[PDB]
Amino acid sequence: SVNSVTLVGVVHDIQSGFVYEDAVTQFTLTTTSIDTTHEVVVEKDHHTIRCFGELFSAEVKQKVKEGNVVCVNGRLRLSPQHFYFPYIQVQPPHGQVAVIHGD
């Protein structure tokens, strides 16, 4: 009964803050699927990525920059806070955020 999410996309809107007295750096991640046919359709999604931990949240806030491309592993979580807000819960050793440095 697992819950896994893997996203590769572009970072916007990095913000550090708190929630329930827990450090959190959150950002939006934009993904773009280019439809595979043999026309030319392109779906684009924005996801809320949320990094828990005093260390990890800080690491993230420091290193990760607007416009970076990254790869994220975490849990798709639904927040009732009927309305359910979907964010990705990322915190080691379960999840991680990888920066992809190009050129």
């Epitope: 931990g53 690491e59 290193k63 990888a98 920066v99 440095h101």
Partner: nanobody
Framework: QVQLQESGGGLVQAGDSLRLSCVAS????????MGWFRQAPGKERAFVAA????????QYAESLKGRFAISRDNAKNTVYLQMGSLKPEDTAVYYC?????????????????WGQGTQVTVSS
């Protein structure tokens, strides 16, 4: 400055897989961000991978995500580099480095400690 020691190098056949280790001397490793770089013939040493202290923030050279993966075990003061689908182009000397600030980076500039390096030869 901390003393780092690569290992696991050697002669390898294309398509193969190799795992490298780096062992840190003494204390403070758990506070260290770690990184791998490599130097190929005719080229300058290049960034490969890095991992924060925590370590949920990893960092990767674009041409090498998918094939390489960095990880650490602080209960062994070791950082690893798992290599997959090896190619001739991966032939190089591979060094580990240590970042005092706990982060790691793509910049050679930003590590205080360096290993001696270990050679990986990928016979085409």
């Amino acid at each position: 400055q901390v003393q780092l020691q690569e290992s696991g190098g050697g002669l390898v056949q294309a398509g193969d897989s190799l795992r490298l280790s780096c062992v840190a001397s003494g204390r403070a490793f758990s506070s260290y961000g770690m990184g791998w770089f490599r130097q190929a013939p005719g080229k300058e040493r290049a960034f490969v991978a890095a991992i924060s202290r925590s370590g949920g923030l990893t960092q990767y050279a674009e041409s090498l995500k998918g094939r390489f993966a960095i990880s650490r075990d602080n209960a062994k003061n070791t950082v690893y580099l798992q290599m997959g689908s090896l190619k001739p182009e991966d032939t190089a000397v591979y060094y580990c480095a240590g970042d005092l600030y706990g982060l790691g980076s793509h910049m050679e500039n930003e590590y205080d400690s360096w290993g001696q390096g270990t050679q990986v030869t990928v016979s085409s």
